[PDB]
């Protein structure tokens, strides 16, 4: 659901920056699906408005989120 | 800078969805850098808070935007 994903991306970007992406975090998220993006991942550009992307750095710290 | 990026990504998500990404639209954006994401593009993920991504469909119609 694009509506929930956008809300959740906003929340991640506001409240979770710098924290480890954990099973607690994934379970607190109602978006589906969820994809974790890492530095150097090579992916094909698709567009799933309901998909929450959580961007992390090399140490699994959350740095951003967006829906696609 | 990230401030202008997030503002413009918001303007785009809010006002330009479905519109062709024309030179007139592109030239009006002040973000730097700006990257256009086309369907099926293979992208190596590296997060850059200042970069405005304009995602278009196969007809160059805007479907989304995010900073990364």
PDB file of C-alpha atoms in Angstrom:
ATOM      1  CA  UNK A   1       0.000   0.000   0.000  1.00  0.00           C
ATOM      2  CA  UNK A   2       1.639   3.241  -1.255  1.00  0.00           C
ATOM      3  CA  UNK A   3      -0.081   5.224   1.506  1.00  0.00           C
ATOM      4  CA  UNK A   4       1.472   3.254   4.384  1.00  0.00           C
ATOM      5  CA  UNK A   5       4.881   3.067   2.682  1.00  0.00           C
ATOM      6  CA  UNK A   6       5.162   6.848   2.356  1.00  0.00           C
ATOM      7  CA  UNK A   7       4.206   7.326   6.005  1.00  0.00           C
ATOM      8  CA  UNK A   8       6.756   4.734   7.059  1.00  0.00           C
ATOM      9  CA  UNK A   9       9.533   6.209   4.884  1.00  0.00           C
ATOM     10  CA  UNK A  10       8.929   9.591   6.545  1.00  0.00           C
ATOM     11  CA  UNK A  11       9.109   7.984   9.989  1.00  0.00           C
ATOM     12  CA  UNK A  12      12.341   6.149   9.218  1.00  0.00           C
ATOM     13  CA  UNK A  13      13.968   9.318   7.902  1.00  0.00           C
ATOM     14  CA  UNK A  14      12.836  11.289  10.949  1.00  0.00           C
ATOM     15  CA  UNK A  15      13.396   8.843  13.789  1.00  0.00           C
ATOM     16  CA  UNK A  16      15.679   5.958  12.833  1.00  0.00           C
ATOM     17  CA  UNK A  17      18.727   7.597  11.247  1.00  0.00           C
ATOM     18  CA  UNK A  18      21.970   6.148  12.582  1.00  0.00           C
ATOM     19  CA  UNK A  19      20.374   3.119  14.233  1.00  0.00           C
ATOM     20  CA  UNK A  20      20.990  -0.537  13.247  1.00  0.00           C
ATOM     21  CA  UNK A  21      18.374  -2.108  10.992  1.00  0.00           C
ATOM     22  CA  UNK A  22      17.047  -4.899  13.184  1.00  0.00           C
ATOM     23  CA  UNK A  23      14.355  -7.556  13.291  1.00  0.00           C
ATOM     24  CA  UNK A  24      12.630  -5.287  15.798  1.00  0.00           C
ATOM     25  CA  UNK A  25      12.590  -2.526  13.218  1.00  0.00           C
ATOM     26  CA  UNK A  26      11.374  -4.762  10.385  1.00  0.00           C
ATOM     27  CA  UNK A  27       8.529  -6.047  12.566  1.00  0.00           C
ATOM     28  CA  UNK A  28       7.511  -2.558  13.706  1.00  0.00           C
ATOM     29  CA  UNK A  29       7.012  -1.709   9.981  1.00  0.00           C
ATOM     30  CA  UNK A  30       3.634  -2.413   8.352  1.00  0.00           C
ATOM     31  CA  UNK A  31       4.917  -1.882   4.821  1.00  0.00           C
ATOM     32  CA  UNK A  32       5.103  -4.710   2.444  1.00  0.00           C
ATOM     33  CA  UNK A  33       7.257  -5.489   0.980  1.00  0.00           C
ATOM     34  CA  UNK A  34      10.503  -4.161   2.526  1.00  0.00           C
ATOM     35  CA  UNK A  35      13.916  -4.113   0.864  1.00  0.00           C
ATOM     36  CA  UNK A  36      17.196  -3.202   2.526  1.00  0.00           C
ATOM     37  CA  UNK A  37      19.593  -1.382   0.207  1.00  0.00           C
ATOM     38  CA  UNK A  38      23.353  -1.582   0.833  1.00  0.00           C
ATOM     39  CA  UNK A  39      26.317   0.316  -0.622  1.00  0.00           C
ATOM     40  CA  UNK A  40      27.285  -1.192  -3.981  1.00  0.00           C
ATOM     41  CA  UNK A  41      24.084  -3.199  -4.543  1.00  0.00           C
ATOM     42  CA  UNK A  42      23.454  -3.260  -8.282  1.00  0.00           C
ATOM     43  CA  UNK A  43      19.706  -3.376  -8.951  1.00  0.00           C
ATOM     44  CA  UNK A  44      17.317  -2.861 -11.835  1.00  0.00           C
ATOM     45  CA  UNK A  45      15.130   0.234 -11.725  1.00  0.00           C
ATOM     46  CA  UNK A  46      11.584  -0.895 -11.162  1.00  0.00           C
ATOM     47  CA  UNK A  47       8.771   0.973  -9.525  1.00  0.00           C
ATOM     48  CA  UNK A  48       6.685  -0.610  -6.771  1.00  0.00           C
ATOM     49  CA  UNK A  49       5.044   2.295  -4.931  1.00  0.00           C
ATOM     50  CA  UNK A  50       4.208   0.012  -1.998  1.00  0.00           C
ATOM     51  CA  UNK A  51       7.762  -1.220  -1.503  1.00  0.00           C
ATOM     52  CA  UNK A  52       9.693   0.397   1.336  1.00  0.00           C
ATOM     53  CA  UNK A  53      13.412   0.689   0.686  1.00  0.00           C
ATOM     54  CA  UNK A  54      15.561   1.118   3.781  1.00  0.00           C
ATOM     55  CA  UNK A  55      18.979   2.412   2.883  1.00  0.00           C
ATOM     56  CA  UNK A  56      21.826   1.370   5.227  1.00  0.00           C
ATOM     57  CA  UNK A  57      25.577   2.028   5.241  1.00  0.00           C
ATOM     58  CA  UNK A  58      28.382  -0.522   5.411  1.00  0.00           C
ATOM     59  CA  UNK A  59      27.832  -0.906   9.168  1.00  0.00           C
ATOM     60  CA  UNK A  60      24.067  -1.605   8.892  1.00  0.00           C
ATOM     61  CA  UNK A  61      23.158   1.868  10.121  1.00  0.00           C
ATOM     62  CA  UNK A  62      19.972   3.313   8.657  1.00  0.00           C
ATOM     63  CA  UNK A  63      20.689   6.365   6.510  1.00  0.00           C
ATOM     64  CA  UNK A  64      17.496   6.893   4.465  1.00  0.00           C
ATOM     65  CA  UNK A  65      14.255   5.415   3.129  1.00  0.00           C
ATOM     66  CA  UNK A  66      11.977   5.723   0.099  1.00  0.00           C
ATOM     67  CA  UNK A  67       9.180   3.918  -1.724  1.00  0.00           C
ATOM     68  CA  UNK A  68       9.943   2.255  -5.077  1.00  0.00           C
TER      69      UNK A  68
ATOM     70  CA  UNK B   1      22.493  20.557  -0.955  1.00  0.00           C
ATOM     71  CA  UNK B   2      20.000  18.172   0.777  1.00  0.00           C
ATOM     72  CA  UNK B   3      17.539  20.927   1.814  1.00  0.00           C
ATOM     73  CA  UNK B   4      16.795  22.002  -1.735  1.00  0.00           C
ATOM     74  CA  UNK B   5      16.846  18.341  -2.848  1.00  0.00           C
ATOM     75  CA  UNK B   6      14.127  17.286  -0.386  1.00  0.00           C
ATOM     76  CA  UNK B   7      12.045  20.377  -1.113  1.00  0.00           C
ATOM     77  CA  UNK B   8      12.161  19.755  -4.865  1.00  0.00           C
ATOM     78  CA  UNK B   9      11.589  15.995  -4.516  1.00  0.00           C
ATOM     79  CA  UNK B  10       8.470  17.036  -2.589  1.00  0.00           C
ATOM     80  CA  UNK B  11       7.394  19.561  -5.222  1.00  0.00           C
ATOM     81  CA  UNK B  12       7.873  16.858  -7.843  1.00  0.00           C
ATOM     82  CA  UNK B  13       5.958  14.139  -5.972  1.00  0.00           C
ATOM     83  CA  UNK B  14       3.167  16.688  -5.378  1.00  0.00           C
ATOM     84  CA  UNK B  15       2.809  18.660  -8.618  1.00  0.00           C
ATOM     85  CA  UNK B  16       4.571  16.898 -11.488  1.00  0.00           C
ATOM     86  CA  UNK B  17       3.498  13.239 -11.282  1.00  0.00           C
ATOM     87  CA  UNK B  18       2.497  12.054 -14.759  1.00  0.00           C
ATOM     88  CA  UNK B  19       4.085  14.992 -16.539  1.00  0.00           C
ATOM     89  CA  UNK B  20       6.817  14.613 -19.155  1.00  0.00           C
ATOM     90  CA  UNK B  21      10.267  15.432 -17.809  1.00  0.00           C
ATOM     91  CA  UNK B  22      10.985  18.247 -20.257  1.00  0.00           C
ATOM     92  CA  UNK B  23      13.977  20.556 -20.489  1.00  0.00           C
ATOM     93  CA  UNK B  24      11.764  23.298 -19.075  1.00  0.00           C
ATOM     94  CA  UNK B  25      11.042  21.221 -15.969  1.00  0.00           C
ATOM     95  CA  UNK B  26      14.644  20.053 -15.668  1.00  0.00           C
ATOM     96  CA  UNK B  27      16.060  23.538 -16.055  1.00  0.00           C
ATOM     97  CA  UNK B  28      13.811  24.875 -13.288  1.00  0.00           C
ATOM     98  CA  UNK B  29      15.195  22.446 -10.681  1.00  0.00           C
ATOM     99  CA  UNK B  30      18.048  23.865  -8.587  1.00  0.00           C
ATOM    100  CA  UNK B  31      19.257  20.564  -7.086  1.00  0.00           C
ATOM    101  CA  UNK B  32      22.737  19.379  -7.979  1.00  0.00           C
ATOM    102  CA  UNK B  33      23.259  16.711  -9.014  1.00  0.00           C
ATOM    103  CA  UNK B  34      20.074  15.487 -10.660  1.00  0.00           C
ATOM    104  CA  UNK B  35      19.873  11.926 -12.010  1.00  0.00           C
ATOM    105  CA  UNK B  36      17.086  10.555 -14.184  1.00  0.00           C
ATOM    106  CA  UNK B  37      16.158   6.929 -13.409  1.00  0.00           C
ATOM    107  CA  UNK B  38      14.743   5.016 -16.408  1.00  0.00           C
ATOM    108  CA  UNK B  39      12.916   1.697 -16.253  1.00  0.00           C
ATOM    109  CA  UNK B  40      15.343  -1.203 -16.284  1.00  0.00           C
ATOM    110  CA  UNK B  41      18.424   0.972 -15.725  1.00  0.00           C
ATOM    111  CA  UNK B  42      21.000  -0.978 -13.742  1.00  0.00           C
ATOM    112  CA  UNK B  43      22.078   1.260 -10.878  1.00  0.00           C
ATOM    113  CA  UNK B  44      24.905   0.807  -8.399  1.00  0.00           C
ATOM    114  CA  UNK B  45      23.516   2.004  -5.106  1.00  0.00           C
ATOM    115  CA  UNK B  46      25.532   4.662  -3.267  1.00  0.00           C
ATOM    116  CA  UNK B  47      23.531   7.131  -1.154  1.00  0.00           C
ATOM    117  CA  UNK B  48      24.045  10.827  -1.825  1.00  0.00           C
ATOM    118  CA  UNK B  49      21.728  13.041   0.218  1.00  0.00           C
ATOM    119  CA  UNK B  50      22.187  15.962  -2.198  1.00  0.00           C
ATOM    120  CA  UNK B  51      21.206  14.075  -5.361  1.00  0.00           C
ATOM    121  CA  UNK B  52      17.701  14.466  -6.721  1.00  0.00           C
ATOM    122  CA  UNK B  53      16.489  11.350  -8.513  1.00  0.00           C
ATOM    123  CA  UNK B  54      13.681  11.793 -10.999  1.00  0.00           C
ATOM    124  CA  UNK B  55      12.140   8.455 -11.885  1.00  0.00           C
ATOM    125  CA  UNK B  56      10.304   8.272 -15.189  1.00  0.00           C
ATOM    126  CA  UNK B  57       8.393   5.586 -17.075  1.00  0.00           C
ATOM    127  CA  UNK B  58       9.153   4.368 -20.584  1.00  0.00           C
ATOM    128  CA  UNK B  59       7.539   7.505 -21.990  1.00  0.00           C
ATOM    129  CA  UNK B  60       9.625   9.926 -19.914  1.00  0.00           C
ATOM    130  CA  UNK B  61       6.634  10.634 -17.669  1.00  0.00           C
ATOM    131  CA  UNK B  62       7.485  11.403 -14.046  1.00  0.00           C
ATOM    132  CA  UNK B  63       6.477   8.607 -11.663  1.00  0.00           C
ATOM    133  CA  UNK B  64       8.456   9.595  -8.573  1.00  0.00           C
ATOM    134  CA  UNK B  65      11.382  11.432  -6.991  1.00  0.00           C
ATOM    135  CA  UNK B  66      13.687  10.912  -4.030  1.00  0.00           C
ATOM    136  CA  UNK B  67      17.035  12.137  -2.783  1.00  0.00           C
ATOM    137  CA  UNK B  68      19.792   9.519  -2.852  1.00  0.00           C
TER     138      UNK B  68
END
